[PDB]
Symmetry: C2
Subunit: 344 residues, 2 copies
């Protein structure tokens, strides 16, 4: 039987229990992911269908979560438009020559996912048409986050170079946003057609921006991306850490689910007119506290979230490497058992 | 004439212009600092009073800012109570064995500033009695932030080990908050006594905490600190980046000035009931944009700020190495000119 719990919650419909999944549920927290990675390498496991499919499905099998998140690199579509993502082991995909001028942006092309990223289309097809009895979430990075990779080149805590570029070259910035939007929409559209039943947009670094600059430089292209993607008739989610101050503006966009970090609580969100379905809150660092703490913190979040039907439980950030899979197994059952009891 | 503009604004009293200073105005943004550092080394520059005083006064002389911030390392008072320091510099100052048990906390001593950090006292006296025509701001790190350095040891992005500790062992955590409070109060008191006319507490990493955890584990000890320190009759400021969601709770404390990062706007803070004097707010990354963008974004902040007497202009974080002194000199003149024109 197909588990519809996640999609019911995503569209604010009644369901029997609260659905769960975790950002980075498939990844370094799992002993088998690591082993597979050291055996086949990052490239084969981000690019080989039989392998990507295994990594994606594992957490579902091991935790009994209500959704699978497609395992792949956030930078996957970039080479299609002419940006070369290189690197070399432990800090793999990095960008050789950063965006510096308007002429760099003008030479950017277009994705043809059927031809350019066939391996991801095939993985989705294998997973959806043949493997999962749980919905598959496809994903893409957002424009700001992708532009930050393309513009910093090297690693950044503050995103000064990216933001200075944004401020100094508004016209170039707008064109870059447009080129990336083109790519994101086509990339996401192909993921949905191949089987994906929801999509999450990760805007990991956009919390570096205040509300004023989000609206000036970022909000319009986001409006374009979600307005287009809404025609695909699948739940659209957005998450980025440290971006609580941007929740209302995200709520304005034609997305369906607003992902929260641990600094905007559910009652607080509703109290601010956040009315669409809400995703996750649990601070990932709590997963390292004694069970007493995990439970008290999780029960509080569930209690608030179960006030309406539009609620998916998740963390307020990604699972990190030294999180115990045993803790995630136990957490997932607690959420399921606690919520279904409540909903009886 | 001594320039008292800064102190008036902090007390929410009428002044003829808006006072300005910048977090990290003395540092690697300056050629003189960089040369001084390669000449004498980090230790000499943070320990010889004549060098520390030079470092501290240089931005005042170069830019004409309205206050000096004491140049010293944030770890300064920690060896005095028995914690490790020094190291490699690449990744900051390292702490050997981190706090793990209650015994590790129980063994911590008390600071005798005269005996322990006399060079800081000497620097403050040199500056105030002989050099500065501008208030000297003293400073200390906050308990949470200082606790974080002591518990992570290494370089941290999300402070999971500290949070884990705080949750797992709350009794020990209270004792640590208590031991750090004591040190901070005596340290700050001594800086006031040497001649500091204001005090800034830096809680750099506290924004990792949501409101509930702030109230449970941090608000009590902070209330104690500002209660005791309020008795000195000097303006008390608190800043920490990424902490806009905690600004209401800081405003509750007997401090005088709320420091804002760029994500809580001035008007916005006022409508949220933040009524006490407010400091700073310009996104430092704007300093790399063309002058016209800088002037315009600053003017937007000044217009909000000048709605009450309680307003000190600053950045929303610290000056970073790539910032031009020319820019900061020109920004300082503008803030003075614009506000004076507007106030007259």
């Amino acid at each position: 039987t197909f588990n519809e719990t996640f999609l019911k919650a995503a569209r604010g419909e009644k369901a029997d229990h609260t659905p769960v999944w975790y950002m980075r549920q498939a990844g370094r927290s799992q002993p088998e992911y690591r082993k597979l990675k050291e055996k086949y390498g990052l490239f084969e496991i981000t690019h080989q269908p039989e392998l990507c499919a295994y990594v994606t499905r594992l957490p579902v099998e091991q935790y009994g979560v209500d959704a699978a998140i497609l395992y792949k690199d956030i930078m996957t579509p970039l080479p299609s438009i002419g940006v070369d993502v290189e690197i070399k082991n432990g800090i793999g995909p990095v960008i050789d020559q950063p965006i510096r001028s308007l002429a760099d942006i003008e030479k950017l092309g277009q994705i043809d996912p059927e031809q350019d990223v066939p391996y991801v289309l095939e993985t989705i097809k294998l997973l959806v048409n043949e493997q999962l009895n749980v919905p598959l979430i496809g994903f893409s990075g957002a424009p700001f986050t992708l532009a930050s990779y393309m513009t910093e080149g090297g690693p950044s805590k503050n995103y000064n170079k990216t933001k200075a570029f944004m401020y100094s070259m508004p016209d170039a910035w707008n064109l870059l946003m447009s080129k990336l939007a083109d790519m994101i929409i086509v990339y996401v559209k192909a993921q949905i057609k191949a089987g994906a039943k929801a999509i999450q947009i990760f805007d990991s670094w956009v919390g570096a921006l205040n509300q004023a600059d989000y609206r000036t430089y970022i909000k319009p292209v986001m409006n374009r991306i979600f307005s287009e993607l809404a025609k695909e008739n699948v739940p659209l989610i957005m998450f980025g850490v440290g971006a609580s101050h941007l929740a209302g503006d995200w709520h304005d966009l034609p997305l369906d689910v607003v992902g929260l970090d641990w600094r905007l609580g559910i009652d607080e969100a509703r109290s601010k007119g956040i009315t669409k379905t809400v995703q996750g809150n649990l601070d990932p660092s709590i997963l390292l506290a004694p069970w007493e703490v995990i439970e008290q913190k999780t029960k509080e979040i569930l209690d608030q979230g179960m006030e309406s039907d539009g609620f998916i439980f998740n963390l307020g950030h990604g699972v990190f490497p030294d999180v115990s899979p045993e803790v995630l197994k136990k957490l997932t059952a607690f959420v399921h058992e606690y919520s279904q009891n409540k909903k009886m």
